[PDB]
Design a protein around this ligand. Structure first.
Ligand SMILES: c1cnc2c(c1)ccc1cccnc12
Ligand SMILES: [Cu+2]
Ligand SMILES: [Cu+2]
Ligand SMILES: [Cu+2]
Length: 266
């Protein structure tokens, strides 16, 4: 006679959990996550912004990297998110407890974050994490300003309903660098067609491809660096092979179209 199964932990490739030292992207912007998950620290004269934290167990590593950059816990002011899955929003609750930081997010991302990623449209309760509350709700095209650095939200619903690209202009060599942190455009194991939980999924992905294509985008980064052809472990040439936003959108749409054809066959 047979017991119910044990809960299964959300396990991931080792590289997703492999710590790295801070890697500078531009004058104020640093990758402080792991080798295969993005967590961006933007340092300003008036405190720091974090865009994503990666997995739940990355909190202490992120704070260690912030310390290495001269950002104490009290200096972290704002947390922004690409999307509220466990592999990007994992440590957010813990970061809020351990720091000054408040969270800004759209309504979709706020509702998913508040349930710790449970009742996911596609994953059910398989990929959960500690719940957190948003301190501010943002609308599409709304800007947030920290220490003179302006962050713009561009909604790109698909991967999750609240999926967001964040854009801001940093500098390098006395010139502006328009950074686009564009969310995932994957649909891993999703039912795309006729999904009762997401009836207009396909139309949203199509609009999201177009949004990503048109972003101000001297430099693209993505929550999974591989999606944009970054190699964070390659030091001075980490970003050399990086995709444009145009190429990223196009590659995603081709994969998505292939997925639709396979789903129809399957
Ligand atoms: C001090 C130093 N660098 C900055 C500011 C203040 C404000 C805005 C800004 C925008 C892009 C790059 N650097 C800065
Ligand atoms: Cu500056
Ligand atoms: Cu995700
Ligand atoms: Cu992810």
């Amino acid at each position: 006679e047979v017991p119910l199964p044990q809960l299964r932990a959300y396990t991931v490739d080792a590289s997703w959990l492999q710590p790295m030292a801070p890697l500078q992207i531009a004058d104020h912007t640093w990758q402080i996550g792991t080798e295969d998950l993005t967590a961006l620290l933007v340092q300003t004269p008036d405190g720091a912004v974090l865009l994503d934290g990666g997995m739940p167990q990355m909190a202490s590593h992120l704070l260690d990297n912030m310390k290495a950059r001269g950002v104490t816990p009290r200096d972290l002011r704002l947390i922004l998110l690409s999307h509220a899955h466990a592999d990007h929003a994992g440590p957010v609750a813990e970061l809020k407890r351990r720091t000054g930081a408040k969270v800004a997010a759209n309504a979709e991302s706020a509702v998913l974050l508040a349930r710790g990623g449970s009742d996911d449209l596609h994953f059910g309760d398989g990929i959960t994490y500690p719940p957190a509350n948003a301190d501010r709700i943002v609308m599409d095209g709304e800007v947030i300003t920290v220490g003179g650095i302006v962050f713009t939200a561009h909604f790109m619903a698909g991967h999750t309903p609240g999926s967001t690209a964040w854009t801001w202009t940093d500098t390098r060599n006395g010139k502006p660098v328009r950074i686009a942190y564009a969310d995932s455009l994957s649909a891993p194991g999703y039912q795309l067609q006729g999904n009762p939980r997401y009836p207009h999924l396909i139309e949203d992905y199509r609009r999201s491809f177009a949004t990503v294509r048109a972003l101000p985008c001297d430099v693209l980064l993505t929550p999974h660096p591989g999606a944009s052809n970054w190699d964070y472990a390659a030091g001075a040439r980490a970003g050399a092979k990086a995709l444009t936003c145009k190429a990223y959108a196009d590659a995603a749409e081709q994969k998505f179209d292939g997925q639709l054809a396979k789903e129809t066959a399957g």
